[PDB]
Every structure is written in C-alpha cells, then in structure tokens.
Amino acid sequence: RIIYDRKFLMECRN
Amino acid sequence: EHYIKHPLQNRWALWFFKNDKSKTWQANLRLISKFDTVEDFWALYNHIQLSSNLMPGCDYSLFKDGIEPMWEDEKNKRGGRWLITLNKQQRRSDLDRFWLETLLCLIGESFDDYSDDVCGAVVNVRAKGDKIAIWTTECENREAVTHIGRVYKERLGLPPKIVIGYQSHADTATTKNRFVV
Ligand SMILES: Nc1nc2c(c(=O)[nH]1)[n+](Cc1ccccc1)cn2[C@@H]1O[C@H](COP(=O)(O)O)[C@@H](O)[C@H]1O
16 A cells, blocks of 8 residues: 655655 | 656546536536646646635545546445535635645545545635535445544644534435534
8 A cells, every 4th residue: 555644745745 | 766756546636616507517527637646746736726716616626536526426426525614714724724635635545444435525615615525435434434534634633623524425415414523
C-alpha cells in the first residue's frame, strides 16, 4: 500500500 | 529516486460542476484532468481556482478514476458521505484549508485499510453555505465509515463541539444521519 504523510505531500507543493 | 515521480495508490480524476438549468444535472459535470503522482497533483491544484473563489453553484469533485462523481455509480449507489457544513464565515477561514486537507487524505490514502472504501470527495460552493464531503462505497460498513469519519475529523482539526453526519445517498436521493462523529 502506497501512503503519504501530510508532511511529505506539503513539502512537494513547489 | 532522483528522477522518478512519486506514485499514488490510485489514479484520481478532478471534475468541475457549473449549474446550467437548461441541462441535465449530469451534463454539467465536466472532467478537468486525471493524475497518479504527487507531482502531477500539485501541478493541477496549483493552477486552478481556490473553492472560495468559485461562482456560487459550482462543485469540485475528486474521485478514483473509473468512479463517476454521481450517486448512480456502481461504487456510490450503496454509499454515503461524511458531510461538513460551512457557514458564510468559514468560507473565509476554513473552506480552502478544509478542502486541501480532504484531497491530501484521499491521495495519501490516510484511512488505513478503509481507504479502499473511499470513492472520492466533493466541495459545494453555495451562497447559502458551503459544503465539503467524503464519499464512501458502502453505508453498511459500520467500521469502515466510522473509522473514516474519526480520522477525517482529526485531520480537519475539528473540536469535540463540532459534530458531523454521515448520510447514505439512498436517503439523500429521496436527511437523517446513519452515523455522527
Ligand atoms: N442524478 C443525480 N443528481 C444529483 C447528484 C447525483 O449524484 N446524481 N447530486 C450530487 C449528490 C450526491 C450525493 C449526495 C448529495 C448530492 C446532486 N444532484 C442533483 O442536484 C440537486 C442539488 O444537489 P447538490 O449537488 O447541490 O448537493 C439534487 O437534489 C439533485 O437533483
């Protein structure tokens, strides 16, 4: 299962 | 890892709804774009209007590819939604925040084994009061629906005072809460 933290996804925004 | 995009568990499809009373509800639903990586999600989100900036009567819907954002879908017609009801002051403080948070819960697969019970989510921009909702596949799955609501409410950071309802689409298409959290 592929799961991402909120923190990882926000760090990707730019 | 230097060059490969970060894949999501699912391909997701973003839809836009604009009310045109001369058309069937369904024909007002238009596909924006699909994406299956973290990077591609941000490329899409970063170039589109914030919900608080849409005309009243518009929706955004993010659903798993193959599941239409309508209660007629095989995967929706037995289900229901966890519903967040906003007043007009929360459009300012909460709407855009709450919605981004909802997408991150979908794409990042935030509900353990019950993320498979998630179909998608919709934001309704309305003059009378905005709404955000997560749709799940089976209103009967007490543990699935119940787990999703608990984690969703935590994720939105809503206080014990706020109580949110889950309504089956069967009830809606005819609204009482099967569950609250
Ligand atoms: N056939 C069909 N019609 C839908 C649908 C839908 O999935 N299928 N929806 C979306 C919907 C799906 C689940 C729960 C509430 C609303 C709204 N509508 C129509 O929009 C009206 C306003 O719904 P709203 O989208 O503003 O919540 C509703 O009474 C229906 O006539």
